[PDB]
Amino acid sequence: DWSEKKLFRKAVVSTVFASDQVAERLRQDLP
Amino acid sequence: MREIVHVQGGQCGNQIGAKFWEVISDEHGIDPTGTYCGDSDLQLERINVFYNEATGGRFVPRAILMDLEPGTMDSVRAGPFGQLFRPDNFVFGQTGAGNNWAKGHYTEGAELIDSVLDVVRKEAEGCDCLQGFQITHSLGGGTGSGMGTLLISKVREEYPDRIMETFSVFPSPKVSDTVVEPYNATLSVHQLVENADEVQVIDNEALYDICFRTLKLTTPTYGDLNHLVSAAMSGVTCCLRFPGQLNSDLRKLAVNLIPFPRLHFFLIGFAPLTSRGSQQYRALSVPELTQQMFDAKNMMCASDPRHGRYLTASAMFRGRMSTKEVDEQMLNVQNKNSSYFVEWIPNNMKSSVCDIPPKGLKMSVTFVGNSTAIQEMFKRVSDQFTAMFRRKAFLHWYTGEGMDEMEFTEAESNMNDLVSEYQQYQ
Amino acid sequence: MREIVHVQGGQCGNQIGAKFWEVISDEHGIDPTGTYCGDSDLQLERINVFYNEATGGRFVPRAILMDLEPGTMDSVRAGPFGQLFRPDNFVFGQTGAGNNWAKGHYTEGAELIDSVLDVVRKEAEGCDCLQGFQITHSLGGGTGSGMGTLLISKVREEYPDRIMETFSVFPSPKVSDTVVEPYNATLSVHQLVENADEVQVIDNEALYDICFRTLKLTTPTYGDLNHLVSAAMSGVTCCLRFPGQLNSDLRKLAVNLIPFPRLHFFLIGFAPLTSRGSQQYRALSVPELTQQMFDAKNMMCASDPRHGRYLTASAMFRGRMSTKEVDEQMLNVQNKNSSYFVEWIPNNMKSSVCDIPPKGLKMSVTFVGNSTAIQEMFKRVSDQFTAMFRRKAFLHWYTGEGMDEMEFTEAESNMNDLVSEYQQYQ
Amino acid sequence: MAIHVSRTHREDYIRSLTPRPA
Amino acid sequence: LILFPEGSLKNSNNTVIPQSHLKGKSVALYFADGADPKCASLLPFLLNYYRTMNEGGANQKIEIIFVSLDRDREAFESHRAHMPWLSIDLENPLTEILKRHFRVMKEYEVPTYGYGSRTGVPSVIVIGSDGREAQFLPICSGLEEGDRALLRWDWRNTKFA
Amino acid sequence: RLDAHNDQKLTSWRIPHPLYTELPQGSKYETHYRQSYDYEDWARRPVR
Amino acid sequence: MREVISIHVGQAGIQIGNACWELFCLEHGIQPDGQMPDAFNTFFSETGAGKHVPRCVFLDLEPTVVDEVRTGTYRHLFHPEQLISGKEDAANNFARGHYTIGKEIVDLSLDRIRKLADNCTGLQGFLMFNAVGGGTGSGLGCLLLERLSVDYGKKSKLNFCSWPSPQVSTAVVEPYNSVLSTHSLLEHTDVAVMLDNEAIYDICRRNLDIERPTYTNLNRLIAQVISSLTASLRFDGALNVDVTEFQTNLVPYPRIHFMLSSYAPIISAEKAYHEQLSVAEITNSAFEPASMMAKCDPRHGKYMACCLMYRGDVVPKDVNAAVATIKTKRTIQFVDWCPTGFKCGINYQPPTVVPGGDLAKVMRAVCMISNSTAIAEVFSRMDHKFDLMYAKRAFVHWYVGEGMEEGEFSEAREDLAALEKDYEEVGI
Amino acid sequence: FAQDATRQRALQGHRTADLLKTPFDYDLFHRTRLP
Ligand SMILES: Nc1nc2c(ncn2[C@@H]2O[C@H](COP(=O)(O)OP(=O)(O)OP(=O)(O)O)[C@@H](O)[C@H]2O)c(=O)[nH]1
Numbered sequence A: 001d002w003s004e005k006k007l008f009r010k011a012v013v014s015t016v017f018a019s020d021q022v023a024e025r026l027r028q029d030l031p
Numbered sequence B, C: 001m002r003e004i005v006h007v008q009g010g011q012c013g014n015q016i017g018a019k020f021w022e023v024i025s026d027e028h029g030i031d032p033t034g035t036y037c038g039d040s041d042l043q044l045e046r047i048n049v050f051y052n053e054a055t056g057g058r059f060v061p062r063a064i065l066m067d068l069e070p071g072t073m074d075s076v077r078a079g080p081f082g083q084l085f086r087p088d089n090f091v092f093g094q095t096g097a098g099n100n101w102a103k104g105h106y107t108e109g110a111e112l113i114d115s116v117l118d119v120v121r122k123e124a125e126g127c128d129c130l131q132g133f134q135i136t137h138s139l140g141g142g143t144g145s146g147m148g149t150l151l152i153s154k155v156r157e158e159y160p161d162r163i164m165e166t167f168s169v170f171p172s173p174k175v176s177d178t179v180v181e182p183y184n185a186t187l188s189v190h191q192l193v194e195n196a197d198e199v200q201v202i203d204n205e206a207l208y209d210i211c212f213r214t215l216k217l218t219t220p221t222y223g224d225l226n227h228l229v230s231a232a233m234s235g236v237t238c239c240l241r242f243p244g245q246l247n248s249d250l251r252k253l254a255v256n257l258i259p260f261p262r263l264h265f266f267l268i269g270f271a272p273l274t275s276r277g278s279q280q281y282r283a284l285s286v287p288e289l290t291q292q293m294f295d296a297k298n299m300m301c302a303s304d305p306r307h308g309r310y311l312t313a314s315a316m317f318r319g320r321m322s323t324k325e326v327d328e329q330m331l332n333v334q335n336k337n338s339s340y341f342v343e344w345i346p347n348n349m350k351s352s353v354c355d356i357p358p359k360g361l362k363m364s365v366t367f368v369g370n371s372t373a374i375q376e377m378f379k380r381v382s383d384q385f386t387a388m389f390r391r392k393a394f395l396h397w398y399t400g401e402g403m404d405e406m407e408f409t410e411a412e413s414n415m416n417d418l419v420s421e422y423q424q425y426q
Numbered sequence D: 001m002a003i004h005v006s007r008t009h010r011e012d013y014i015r016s017l018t019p020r021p022a
Numbered sequence E: 001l002i003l004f005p006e007g008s009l010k011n012s013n014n015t016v017i018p019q020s021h022l023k024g025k026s027v028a029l030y031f032a033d034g035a036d037p038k039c040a041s042l043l044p045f046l047l048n049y050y051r052t053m054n055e056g057g058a059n060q061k062i063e064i065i066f067v068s069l070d071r072d073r074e075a076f077e078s079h080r081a082h083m084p085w086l087s088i089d090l091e092n093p094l095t096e097i098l099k100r101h102f103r104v105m106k107e108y109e110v111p112t113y114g115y116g117s118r119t120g121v122p123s124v125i126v127i128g129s130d131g132r133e134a135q136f137l138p139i140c141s142g143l144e145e146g147d148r149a150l151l152r153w154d155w156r157n158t159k160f161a
Numbered sequence F: 001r002l003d004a005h006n007d008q009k010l011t012s013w014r015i016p017h018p019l020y021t022e023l024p025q026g027s028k029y030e031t032h033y034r035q036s037y038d039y040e041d042w043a044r045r046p047v048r
Numbered sequence G: 001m002r003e004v005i006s007i008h009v010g011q012a013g014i015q016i017g018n019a020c021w022e023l024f025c026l027e028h029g030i031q032p033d034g035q036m037p038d039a040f041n042t043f044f045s046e047t048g049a050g051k052h053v054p055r056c057v058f059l060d061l062e063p064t065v066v067d068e069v070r071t072g073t074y075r076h077l078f079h080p081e082q083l084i085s086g087k088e089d090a091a092n093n094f095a096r097g098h099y100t101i102g103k104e105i106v107d108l109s110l111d112r113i114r115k116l117a118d119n120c121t122g123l124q125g126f127l128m129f130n131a132v133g134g135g136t137g138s139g140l141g142c143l144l145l146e147r148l149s150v151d152y153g154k155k156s157k158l159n160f161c162s163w164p165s166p167q168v169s170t171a172v173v174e175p176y177n178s179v180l181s182t183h184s185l186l187e188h189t190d191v192a193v194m195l196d197n198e199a200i201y202d203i204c205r206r207n208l209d210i211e212r213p214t215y216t217n218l219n220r221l222i223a224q225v226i227s228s229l230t231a232s233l234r235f236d237g238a239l240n241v242d243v244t245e246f247q248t249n250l251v252p253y254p255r256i257h258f259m260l261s262s263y264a265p266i267i268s269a270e271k272a273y274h275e276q277l278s279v280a281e282i283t284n285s286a287f288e289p290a291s292m293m294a295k296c297d298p299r300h301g302k303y304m305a306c307c308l309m310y311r312g313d314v315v316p317k318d319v320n321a322a323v324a325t326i327k328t329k330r331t332i333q334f335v336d337w338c339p340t341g342f343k344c345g346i347n348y349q350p351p352t353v354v355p356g357g358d359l360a361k362v363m364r365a366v367c368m369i370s371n372s373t374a375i376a377e378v379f380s381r382m383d384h385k386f387d388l389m390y391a392k393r394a395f396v397h398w399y400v401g402e403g404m405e406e407g408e409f410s411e412a413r414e415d416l417a418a419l420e421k422d423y424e425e426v427g428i
Numbered sequence H: 001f002a003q004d005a006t007r008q009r010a011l012q013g014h015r016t017a018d019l020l021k022t023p024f025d026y027d028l029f030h031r032t033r034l035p
């Protein structure tokens, strides 16, 4: 190996932390 | 100006703090690369409270992301609004707490708290004058309670005069993952009661309750729950960064609510919170906002308000409104609800106004409340703690790394001292 | 008449000098052929500090490449920025030291000292007079220490009133090649403490620790370590070759740091030092540069300054900065680290500002400071010596070349006298 | 005594740049 | 002399004004880039400075002429919409005349000409009548007093007279 | 490539391939005395 | 006729006068090539037709800053022979600047002094600009003054010493340089003006409200306060005060000639839009502890004698009203051995400003010049600074190796102690 | 001898020169002095 430190892995942020929903429900994004 | 140093402790703290940095970044118009948009004076004139200039026109959050397992913050960088944080500010663990208070506090947290303090004083000393340290963590998880509260205690002796505000999320009775729930909760509160100026309590079952009964939300996710807490997490700090006709600061809330120093545990709430079919049908005004304010189902803490007396309470409004409809709506709720308010204090209500509403909302408010009816969570945590303690269950994972038997006993002695102190103020 | 004559001592001195001459040739805009470039008049404005004219408009370095084995001197000649030196400056050794002090100092020393002084005279009275010399050497090998310090031992009485600036690479605590490490270390110190005007310690495992935890490179080659040290003395002599509103010389550092003539062992910092993700996210300013500079992990001598007292210190700045942020962040460090300094000197540290920075640097500091924290290595060399001298082992390689008992015992007698010397200044 | 270019200011240089511009 | 041509100045509402329009007004050139993070942090403060001091005024006191460092017509008009005052069109000859005149360019130096310093993005150069630098407002300089150096504007003695 | 936090300066040495084309040499001076006291054109003059 | 010779030693001295002679040529309107596009003769001599040569000499032992002025902007007005380059720096040593390497420069500098003073009769004074903490500023700074008292023993050697701050000193052997040069500076100067670094740092933060000064911003203020001192020399005024008069009304005993200064207004352009620059308030604004040049609190001191000279269109009527205002004030408690304590100098010339510097303009500039008994504390902190370093003879092997024998460290202790007690016995 | 590009630039320390540079817009110098 020769490159810089890999600090963080690939990370698929699935629906467990993919918030939305209450995002528009609190930000008043209209019907 | 005055600086707030955020620390995200544990897996819970990292996730709820990441949503806090997202809800404050769009609040300040910050591009997720780090730049600015929105062309307004009033936003960036006080942005140093949570951000630092990085000699390139980008604003780095003053956030200390940490826990003992690298698998948590590896996901928040790849998520949105994650590359704003400084990578060297991230401090890692390698072994991870085994879901316990003791391997957090004593064994694997002592050699990491040296580097944690160094990056805290990296941020604290670099400014002229600092307001307080703000820490989001959980009182049910291993690294969120073990050396999370050790970080709370150890920063006190160097910085005792700045305010010490923390958000703590407690285990839930009806849904019990994280199998050692009361051992982490009881044995962290007895240390968090004397080394923290102000602690706000959150229960996950209450955050679930606001999803079903109020929002009519079908499937609530963990990231959604972190946005519920992030709404009043930014609402408690609106006037710290934005102007107002009646100001509010973190020391303003601390001095004006708790009458006694050992009592520093609060409820919280956020209004308005509408549902899918009730945006354009529900009025948004101060008289209705106070009725949703003092709603038992509105509370994000599962300690019941109407089973006891409100010692004090606070309602910090947000937006453009008339401030004496803020005032008289505090008056009349004390008028109709006399038994729900404590009798040896007239005018339990403190109110203030931040002039900047949250985006898209004309008007909002946050609750910083102080009830003596927080006992139903205290005795419920305490009696499962004594349930597993009298039969000596799951003690081998705790006492095998240099703990005496008397720390649990004095943790319970502090625990029922809190119960007895609060019960005699009925 | 302001010249510093460089001397390359041993294999370690050849690579650390070849990298140093490269980072000052392109600092001064110099072709490896020898012509002048660089689009700024400052670079030839002070060019005779390290160079001389080659009677064709060409610039030749004023350095003496010296080693006992021609392989490493062929390697720096075939490498880039190696054709700058005139071929007569190189002096060749054939036999090569067997990593022995007695071999380099006594046996084949006398057959090469007659030549290596004849080449350093002709550079010295090439001008009417100068201020002194700089050398680069190591304490681990045979040719890097033996006539590396014997060259000092003859020029000391040749030019008595001239600064004798020496870069010594000390043997590492945790790792050790060339198994007779303390035999070359103690037997060089016991005459370098009175024949060298000003000495700097360069620790190998300190350098790897810097390049792993604050520079975040994974597999540091010795060339990578060479560049990190080459930037250290590019700064300490930068004001000799470049203007500033606070002028400073190497004699200026010598009088401001050396209280007493025996004690002149100096620790070195170079800042700023970040990784690829941290360059963009970190501010570049004086208050953060100095506060990062006063850290143990920046220091390229890894004797912990927390376990000692800074008797005095010095910071030379490089870039377009003012002077008072050098000043009141000096005193801010002074009162914050009140017990980390020495009490009978208030305002312990001297400072300097130089106008030009290194290439692509905003503000940089070289930190030449005299601390008593350095005993953790000098008692470490002393008790590693007495572990092998008591058992007599690995010393019959030295007896037949001129070593005897009373010069050996004089070595630790000068050693522990200096160890106990610093303890009583505490 | 080494002699440098007139753009290097060692010894007399104000009265050396003006007679011979180098 | 005539610093600008007849069809060079360019303000809001999409109309041209001549050079005698700047008579008796404090005139300043805004060397700035659309996507530059310095400019994102600084443009709202110029917007308020332009707001309060001449709106609460007896006569017109300040004009700022944006002179652009951008890369595209579409990127030029997008930054244009967020800004009301005077400006100069990017692809006239004028931008690269006042660029070398006031030493304000963006490390593209050697591929064009062999001079030295650049003093680039961002900068405001309040100027006199004859194209002279009147005084420097130090956002990014040796002072590096960003976001506050607007208070160092000397508006009484710098007039386009 | 300015906007993506340009990290190398070798693009300025592409044009001077002999580095003796009379264009860049003697073009700048970076001392604090010219930061405070230096004006339009009375800095580089011949002596009469 | 009328002339004054300005001498600069040390790096502080060369760049202070680099701002002084900039402000002087800005006053007379001469282009800084030496050409103008009879009142300037006190600072400049006429050499030929329209060519102005300064009456300044530049001295140091380290050539990196004399050659920076030579190659700088002022290459032709500053004729190339007024500047002197040294061999090597004194390196923060009085002993090096005075004994070893100062002998090769003092011979050339004094050969300049009597060939610059023999040009015309009526020599009036010397403006010695030195840094006490620096090695060549106090070394060659000292060595020039006893030699100037031998040949020109009946003339005035006025001095400008930058005293160090209690906290900001930027050198370790700095208090060793201050103690050992003040005694030898004492009976060889006749007027001493002590400034400070941190004092003017506090001024630039407070009333000129830059967060970010540097040494050249220090040099704008000191060049202004010297220029106001020399305002009645070059140009015309109602009550003109000359060099032979600053000592006439400040020094009561030959020992007590150390003395503070200040300046008012020190303001920005936004700081002049909104307030009186009236005579009745500028004197008040120049007397507070947050205004002088030495951060020396006079509230526990006692004012003794003071010149208060003005420049601009100003009338001595409201000057007289402002004088009675100060005398009726109880906080500024004057001494009892002189009920009179003032001079009010006055001059008609408008206060010049540098275009580019942050010091905005005004039609009244006031330099406060004051002798006071408050000097006892600023030298007492200087005394216990030396006593703590001299406990086990620290940093003394450098000085005794240069040839300065052990023993003349020690009378410098009781000579400054004798000076310190002089402030108590004059204030009783 | 494995004379590849990454091997040669590692031993020559070209990577340490890359990280020791400051990656933003660099040379600022304005003359505040007015005629
Ligand atoms: N007031 C003022 N003081 C200065 C200035 N520059 C340097 N000094 C003071 O000068 C003292 C040290 O002397 P230097 O000017 O640094 O150097 P020097 O006078 O040439 O003497 P050496 O140190 O031997 O070189 C410091 O303690 C500073 O306080 C300046 O621009 N203004």
Ligand SMILES: Nc1nc2c(ncn2[C@@H]2O[C@H](COP(=O)(O)OP(=O)(O)O)[C@@H](O)[C@H]2O)c(=O)[nH]1
Pocket: B009, B010, B011, B012, B013, B015, B016, B067, B097, B099, B138, B140, B141, B142, B143, B144, B169, B176, B177, B178, B204, B222, B223, B225, B226
């Ligand atoms: N608010 C919130 N609570 C969570 C989250 N993840 C887990 N929890 C709750 O907290 C408990 C997990 O403990 P945790 O503090 O994450 O353990 P840790 O890994 O040692 O920090 C579970 O019982 C969950 O109910 C989250 O993202 N947000």
Ligand SMILES: Nc1nc2c(ncn2[C@@H]2O[C@H](COP(=O)(O)OP(=O)(O)O)[C@@H](O)[C@H]2O)c(=O)[nH]1
Pocket: C010, C011, C012, C013, C015, C097, C098, C099, C138, C139, C140, C141, C142, C143, C144, C145, C170, C171, C172, C177, C178, C204, C222
């Ligand atoms: N030049 C160089 N020195 C090293 C390296 N690794 C370690 N060192 C240090 O260099 C010393 C080796 O001695 P050296 O001077 O090279 O032997 P000599 O040439 O016979 O005098 C040891 O004490 C090591 O601490 C490397 O890769 N190159």
Ligand SMILES: [Mg+2]
Pocket: C247, G011, G060, G061, G062, G063, G064, G065, G066
């Ligand atoms: Mg000099």
